[PDB]
Structure 1
């Protein structure tokens, strides 16, 4: 956790690089287990060989740990941190809609910066464009004080279109958090579930409302169960308009709401723990359901849930207020 942090960090640097710049998914994946394993390792890695001793740790990595332990740096690390090509790729990627793949293309075309991009807005697609237009706004954290203003709007509009909708804003926003990265809404309706054959309107209707009133400003991707947009809190009394925010709206069959809800509320660590304990209490959990575990190895069948409460109950545990859903 701090006893092999350098090593873990450098390995993650390297790992990322293979994957982002090179196309070395194998290599990439190589660094990853390595860091994962050195990461659990209970002692102070005093040398390559010592390390090598671990699984996932080969000769090449061992080599690398030595240089790093021998000197405060790594030439390779040094050489990559410079290289403009490599850097371009880490930067382009910052745009919403540009992945590594794309970053490689543009660089090879010479587009290496924000300006480059504007000059060539022809070469970017819709998502990528929006991304380019909201680069700043997009990187801006979201303060709870705005989060609440947003939540207030969405929920009110959803209510209007159908008294029967159920919306919930998950995320860390849900677990307390002072600020968040984006708005993530869970959506359901009684008239939509597991068997029930679709109802796309179920989601399209609300998206419309949201744009009707102007909260939603752009559509990144709109499907029949997941919407990827851009919202914005109405600029009050002209002098202070708000930054543009990322938002997601996703439909869920009512019969699988709470597990999702649970789930999305995280945090990752809380999940896991809960997950393992479910496992203990003779259960299974994942994103959509909780199933009683048979003994033959495994087994299925959806246990019926009416709230996050039903879940905990099931695994016989202390209902956890979202705030304490921390670890």
Structure 2
């Protein structure tokens, strides 16, 4: 259950700025993660907060954050923020990172080499790599929320081609999209083939082939990176005659060994909080999970040998939990 706007947005928002600043400008992921974490739980939090103490209570919340929360309650702002908002470099530094391929080093490098806008980018592509190129290119597309309708749509295309290419494959769209989301950010493609498993001799072709196909059929426009197992690229929906071009979008496809799929599936489907809790119970029944497998916890304190997973269920099976519907994997 989550309410939150006229409630604690002021806070969650400030925090997010904070987080960004750490990541991008700071180069402190942990700190970004920390601020995000705080931002989340408080998001979920049913009350009109009234102080830090109140929030301290939150798990994630703490001293400094709560300190902030007081100024903010009191002032309606965070002074830190104003100097940050007013500091040149920082902002530009935060902006550029928006650009897919551009991280904090690049972004800071650029800003030092004077570059600090799309333009500068545009006027400097000899100074960008591919990934960065496509990202600059697709800048607005990417930040576009994707529509499930489309998702569905997109969902269908990717779905058949694979089917066209080979019949034995398996794919599945994961993410919020799997969780039943009205909208998404990208398309996570989870796939595998029978001929591809754990101790098996890999067919790059497999993945290859699925790409090409989707390529062949002008589904996937660009290509961020690709190798025997992972492919990250740009894809689009064929334009309806006299109907303006939709947006281009993120899509990644992942190939997995059949023995680890569901784990992968399960893993990749989320939620994140869900995974945590699950990791927990699964543990309670004496096992340790991950993206790949499920292991029987050692009678000692830890002990190898992964179990036979033929489904998501099975997973659920081992830990004595009802096979949850991806829909309610909210946690």
**One fold, TM greater than 0.5?**
yes
**252-261 or 32-41: which moved more?**
32-41
Q: How far did residue 142 of structure 1 move?
A: 1.0
Structure 1 residues 136, 50: closer, same or farther in 2, change over 3 A? Answer: closer
Determine helix, strand or coil for the equivalent of 1:57.
Answer: coil
- The 3 A distance-change label for structure 1 pair 51 and 263 is closer
Task: Tell me by how many angstroms 1:121 deviates.
Answer: 1.8
Mark the CA change 1:238 to 1:59 in structure 2 (over 3 Å): closer, same or farther.
closer
Q: Which moved more, 1:43-52 or 1:237-246?
A: 43-52
Query: Residue 243 and residue 10 in structure 1: after superposition, are their counterparts in 2 closer, same or farther (change >3 A)?
Result: closer
Does structure 1 residue 288 correspond to structure 2 residue 292?
A: yes
Are 2:204 and 2:228, in contact at CA under 8 Å, matched by a contact in 1? Answer: yes
CA distance in 2, matches of 1:181, 1:216: 16
- Give distance in 2, aligned partners of 1:180 and 1:166: 22
Shift of 1:184: 0.7
User: In 2 relative to 1, CA 202–32 (structure 1 residues): closer, same or farther, beyond 3 Å?
Assistant: closer
- After TM superposition, the score normalised by the length of structure 2 is 0.85
Q: Is the 2:24–2:97 contact (alpha carbons within 8 Å) kept by the matching residues of 1?
A: no
* Higher alpha-carbon deviation: 300-309 or 76-85: 76-85
Displacement of 1:35: 8.2
SS at match of 2:54: helix
Q: Is 1:26 the counterpart of 2:6 in the alignment?
A: no
Question: In 2, Cα distance between the equivalents of 1:164 and 1:49?
Answer: 57
Distance apart, 1:36 and its partner CA:
9.9
1:266-308 Cα shifts (integer Å, max 9, x gaps): 1112222222111112211111111111221111211101111
Inter-CA distance 4–233: structure 2 relative to 1 (3 Å threshold): closer
SS of 2:221 mapped into structure 1: strand
CA apart distance, 1:17 = 2.4
Deviation at 1:55, TM superposition (A): 12
Tell me the distance in 1 between the aligned counterparts of 2:117 and 2:156: 38
Matched, 1:225 2:229: yes
Match of 2:277 in 1: 273
**Aligned mate of 1:326, from 320, 323, 330:** 330
Aligned length: 327
Instruction: Tell whether the 8 Å contact from 2:21 to 2:94 is kept in structure 1 after alignment.
Output: no
**Counterparts of 2:104 and 2:152 in 1: how far apart (Å)?**
34
Question: 38-47 or 304-313, which moves further after superposition?
Answer: 38-47
* 1:30 to partner: Cα distance: 8.5
Task: State the Cα distance separating 1:239 from its structure 2 match.
Answer: 2.9
Instruction: String of CA shifts for 1:22-41, please: whole Å, max 9, x gaps.
Output: 45679778878998999999
Shift of 1:19: 4.0
Tell me the CA shift for residue 216 of structure 1: 1.0
CA shift in 2, pair 1:56/1:254, >3 Å: closer
Q: Secondary structure at the match of 2:90?
A: helix
Measure how far apart 1:20 and its partner are.
Answer: 2.3
Q: Report the Cα offset of residue 64 of structure 1.
A: 6.0
Residues 91 and 258 (structure 1), Cα distance of their counterparts in 2 relative to 1, 3 Å cut: same
Among candidates 303, 306, 310, match of residue 307 of structure 2: 303
CA RMSD of aligned residues (A): 3.5
Which is worse superposed, 110-119 or 10-19?
A: 10-19
Q: Structure 2 vs 1, CA of residues 212 and 75 (structure 1 numbering), >3 Å: closer, same or farther?
A: same
Structure 2 stretches lacking a partner, 5+ long: none
Supply the distance in 2 between the matched residues of 1:72 and 1:264 (Cα, whole angstroms).
Answer: 39
5+ long unaligned stretches in structure 1: none
Residue pairs, 1:130-141, within 5 angstroms: 130-141=134-145
Deviation (angstroms), 1:59 = 9.3
Distance 2:64 2:163 in 1: 59
